[PDB]
């Protein structure tokens, strides 16, 4: 379901910066060129997210992470809520 998210985000960025580009003068053609080049550009493990709560019990870490993106084995996953446990 990842690429649907990226399509949504890309459309979002485009209809947002459309007026900015019409304002500063950047014609729509350059904008669509950016869009296309970005899409084509789309083709270590890191989780970047927002922690809703990180709890510790003397060894036991319990993470409750909000919206986040992961880079597990080169393939990038999405999650809207990630509970997790760990032992120090």
């Amino acid at each position: 379901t990842v690429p649907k998210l990226y399509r949504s985000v890309i459309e979002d960025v485009i209809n947002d910066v459309r007026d900015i580009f019409l304002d500063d003068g950047v014609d729509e053609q350059v904008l669509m060129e950016l869009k296309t080049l970005w899409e084509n550009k789309l083709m270590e493990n890191v989780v970047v997210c927002q922690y809703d709560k990180i709890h510790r019990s003397k060894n036991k870490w319990k993470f409750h992470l909000k919206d986040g993106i992961m880079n597990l084995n080169g393939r990038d996953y999405i999650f809207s809520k990630a509970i997790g446990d760990a032992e120090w």
């Binding site: 949504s8 209809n15 947002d16 910066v17 007026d19 019409l22 304002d23 446990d85």
Partner: protein, 274 residues
């Protein structure tokens, strides 16, 4: 023995619900998730399959229709507003550091233009807010924000584009409308339903046209009994007999052109004495 009885009673006080043993029968204790998916489930998902959950159909409630209408309207507004909001903020940030009075006046003109466009947006009537019944919205945003998650994105999408969008005639069928429906059905043959919905002179989808045709289609049921029909009915009844109260539905679903009403009437009146 008495102390053993007391221990039994205590463990009764200290004594799972058969709810904790549904589809993820093996739930974890450190988490709530079950075991990973099975290679058989992988193979079954591939080659296509419909799991039990994916087949659940819930009848739409009255209030859900209003909720979807309000959701579509609000998200159309947000999508229309985000560009102008960013334009206005960019103009203001440019004014903050322009330090040129003629350029500042040009920027204030552009900002007044942006504000005027925003005012036109927030005064746009409901019609232009609706759309062309085929436009796009962040339906995955709807299903998670406006709806609690009770409906999938594509479900809402199909309900909206095909059914709920107010550009679809929901009125009753007039004599003239029913006449035209069968007229066009005959002219095209009882197959070409999209073109018929188009030619009907109304915005009723092909689905509703076919519904109104079937509900008055006499060839839907055979209405006349034949001996081979009777033979098949007897064979089926004897196969799925339980004594009395033969399931007529599961019999119909093995026959063609018949419904449980006619099967009941036939089995009672001409397939057993009485």
């Amino acid at each position: 023995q008495n102390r053993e009885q007391q221990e039994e009673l205590m463990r009764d006080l200290a004594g799972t619900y058969m709810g904790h043993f549904m589809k993820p029968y093996f739930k974890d204790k450190v988490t709530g998730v079950g075991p990973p998916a099975n290679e058989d489930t992988r193979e079954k998902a591939a080659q296509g399959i419909k799991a039990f959950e994916e087949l659940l159909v819930t009848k739409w409630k009255n209030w859900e229709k209003a909720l979807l209408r309000k959701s579509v309207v609000s998200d159309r507004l947000q999508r229309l507003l985000q560009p102008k909001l960013l334009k206005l903020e960019y103009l203001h940030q440019k004014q903050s550091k322009v330090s040129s009075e003629l350029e500042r006046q040009a920027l204030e003109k552009q900002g007044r233009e942006a504000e005027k466009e925003i005012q036109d947006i927030n005064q746009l009537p409901e019609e232009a807010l609706l759309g062309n019944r085929l436009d796009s919205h962040d339906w995955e945003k709807i299903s998670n924000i406006n709806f609690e998650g009770s409906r999938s994105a594509e479900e809402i999408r199909k309900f909206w584009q095909n059914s709920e969008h107010p550009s679809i005639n929901k009125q009753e069928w007039s004599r003239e409308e029913e006449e035209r429906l069968q007229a066009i059905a005959a002219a095209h043959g009882h197959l070409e339903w999209q073109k018929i919905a188009e030619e009907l002179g109304t915005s009723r989808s092909a689905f509703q046209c076919l519904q109104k045709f079937q509900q008055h289609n006499k060839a839907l049921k055979r209405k006349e009994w034949t001996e081979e029909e009777d033979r098949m009915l007897t064979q089926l009844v004897q196969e799925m007999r339980v004594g009395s109260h033969i399931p007529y539905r599961r019999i119909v679903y093995y026959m063609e052109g018949r419904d449980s009403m006619q099967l009941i009437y036939r089995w009672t009146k001409s397939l057993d004495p009485g």
